[PDB]
Design a protein around this ligand. Structure first.
Ligand SMILES: *CCC(=O)N1CCN(c2nc(OC[C@@H]3CCCN3C)nc3c(F)c(-c4nc(N)cc(C)c4C(F)(F)F)c(Cl)cc23)[C@@H](C)C1
Ligand SMILES: *CCC(=O)N1CCN(c2nc(OC[C@@H]3CCCN3C)nc3c(F)c(-c4nc(N)cc(C)c4C(F)(F)F)c(Cl)cc23)[C@@H](C)C1
Ligand SMILES: Nc1nc2c(ncn2[C@@H]2O[C@H](COP(=O)(O)OP(=O)(O)O)[C@@H](O)[C@H]2O)c(=O)[nH]1
Ligand SMILES: Nc1nc2c(ncn2[C@@H]2O[C@H](COP(=O)(O)OP(=O)(O)O)[C@@H](O)[C@H]2O)c(=O)[nH]1
Ligand SMILES: [Br-]
Ligand SMILES: [Br-]
Ligand SMILES: [Br-]
Ligand SMILES: [F-]
Ligand SMILES: [Mg+2]
Ligand SMILES: [Mg+2]
Lengths: 178, 165
C-alpha cells in the first residue's frame, strides 16, 4: 500500500515544452534517487532472427529512499501534460499522443494540462489553445480525465503558478481518495 | 521491420557491480530525474502531501523503440558480490520481486570472481530455487566467456518471457 502521505507526479510532454523549467519554478522546497535507462541492441544484424532491443534500468541513490517509497515506480500517478503555447494549436494536437499513452497505460490517472510560454504567446494563440482543449480534449472518449488546464510562465514566480501549485495539491488529494 | 522488445531490471545491493556489469555487457540514453516535493507538510490542520516527481530526458527515438518502457513485466538481473560471502541480503530483493511481479523471471549474477572457493558455497544456498531462470558467476570488469554466456542467457530468457511457449 502506498504511504498515506505519498504519491507520484509525472511531468510529461514534448521536448522544449518547459517541463524541467516548470518543475524548477514550482518547487521552492525540497526533501536519494537515481535511474539510468539505456537502450541495448542486444541482438541485431542476425540473418535469420528478428532484432531484440532491451531497455535496461540501472538504479542509484540511498537505500532509505527505496525503503520509504515502496511503490515509487507505479504508473498510477498525477500527470502534468505540458506543452508550449507559443508553438500554436499544432502543439496541443501533439499533446494527444501523451494523453493517449496515459489513457492506455494508466487509465485511472488524472491529468492537468499546462501551457508554458505564456509571456511569449499572443492572445490569439491562448484562445485557440483553450478552444481546442475544451472542444476536443475535455471529457472525450479515449482521453484520460483532464481535471484542469492552466496557462503559465514557467520562468518566474506569479499568481498563476501558485494557483497551479494549489491545483496540484487538490488534485493529488482527490486522487488519494480514489 | 518487426523486432522484439523487452525490459531489463538490474537490482542488487549497492556496490554489487551492477553498473560495471551493464557497461561491459553492452560492449539514445534516457535520463530520469526523480525528486521528492514536500508540497504540503508541517501544517497540523492539513493532510501532508509529499510528491515523487519524475522528469524525463533523452532522445525521442528511444520512446519510439520502447513505447512501454514503464511496464512492470520485465526480466530481472539480481546482482551480488560473491566476495562478501551479501548472499543473504539478495534474498530480500527476490522477495520484493516475487511479490511485486510473481510472473517476472530472474537471473542471479555473482560478480567479483577474480578476488574463490567460498563463492561455490553460494551455489548451495541458491539450490532459493520468483522464477529463478539461471545463475552465473562472472568478473564484470572485462570481457570473458562467462560474460558472453550471460549475454546469451539474457537474450534467451527475454524471448522466453515475451514469446508464449
Ligand atoms: C527533450 C527530451 C524530453 O524532454 N523527453 C520527454 C519525454 N519524451 C517522450 N516522448 C514521447 O514521444 C516522442 C515521439 C513523439 C511521437 C512518439 N515519439 C516518437 N513519448 C513519451 C511517452 F509516451 C512517455 C510515456 N511512456 C509510457 N510508457 C507511459 C506513459 C504514461 C508516458 C507518458 F508520457 F504519457 F506519460 C514518456 Cl514518459 C515520455 C515520452 C521524450 C520526448 C523525451
Ligand atoms: C548504489 C546504489 C544502487 O545501485 N541502488 C540500487 C538498489 N537500491 C535498492 N535498495 C533497496 O533496499 C534494500 C532492500 C532489499 C530488498 C529491496 N530493499 C527493500 N531496495 C531497493 C528496491 F526495493 C528497489 C525496488 N523498488 C521497487 N519499488 C520495486 C522493485 C521491484 C524494486 C526492485 F527491483 F529492486 F526489486 C530498487 Cl529498484 C532498488 C533498491 C539502492 C541501494 C540504490
Ligand atoms: N520565455 C519562456 N521560456 C520558457 C518557458 N518555459 C520554458 N522556457 C524555456 O524553453 C526551453 C525549454 O525549457 P525546458 O524546461 O528545457 O523544456 P523541456 O524540454 O520540456 O524540459 C528553455 O530555454 C526554457 O528556459 C516560459 O514559460 N517562458
Ligand atoms: N574485481 C572486481 N571488481 C568489480 C567487479 N564488479 C564490479 N567491480 C567494482 O566494484 C565497484 C562496483 O561499483 P558499481 O558498478 O557502481 O556497483 P553498483 O552500485 O552495484 O552498480 C566498482 O569499483 C567496480 O569496478 C568484479 O566482478 N570484480
Ligand atoms: Br513548494
Ligand atoms: Br513499484
Ligand atoms: Br508502459
Ligand atoms: F511491449
Ligand atoms: Mg527537460
Ligand atoms: Mg551504479
Amino acid at each position: 500500500a502506498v504511504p498515506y502521505n505519498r504519491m507520484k507526479l509525472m511531468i510529461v510532454g514534448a521536448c522544449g515544452s518547459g517541463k524541467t523549467t516548470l518543475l524548477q519554478q514550482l518547487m521552492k522546497t525540497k526533501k536519494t534517487v537515481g535511474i539510468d535507462v539505456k537502450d541495448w541492441p542486444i541482438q541485431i544484424r542476425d540473418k535469420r532472427k528478428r532484432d531484440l532491443v532491451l531497455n535496461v534500468w540501472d538504479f542509484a541513490g540511498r537505500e532509505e529512499f527505496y525503503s520509504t517509497h515502496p511503490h515509487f515506480m507505479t504508473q498510477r500517478a498525477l500527470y502534468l501534460a505540458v506543452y508550449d503555447l507559443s508553438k500554436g494549436q499544432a502543439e496541443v494536437d501533439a499533446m494527444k499522443h501523451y494523453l493517449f499513452q496515459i489513457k492506455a497505460r494508466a487509465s485511472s490517472s488524472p491529468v492537468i494540462l499546462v501551457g508554458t510560454h505564456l509571456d511569449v504567446s499572443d492572445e490569439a494563440q491562448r484562445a485557440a489553445a483553450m478552444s481546442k482543449i475544451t472542444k476536443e480534449l475535455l471529457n472525450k472518449r479515449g482521453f484520460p480525465a483532464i481535471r484542469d488546464y492552466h496557462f503559465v510562465n514557467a520562468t518566474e514566480e506569479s499568481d498563476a503558478l501558485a494557483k497551479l501549485r494549489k491545483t496540484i495539491i487538490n488534485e493529488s488529494l482527490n486522487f488519494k481518495i480514489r
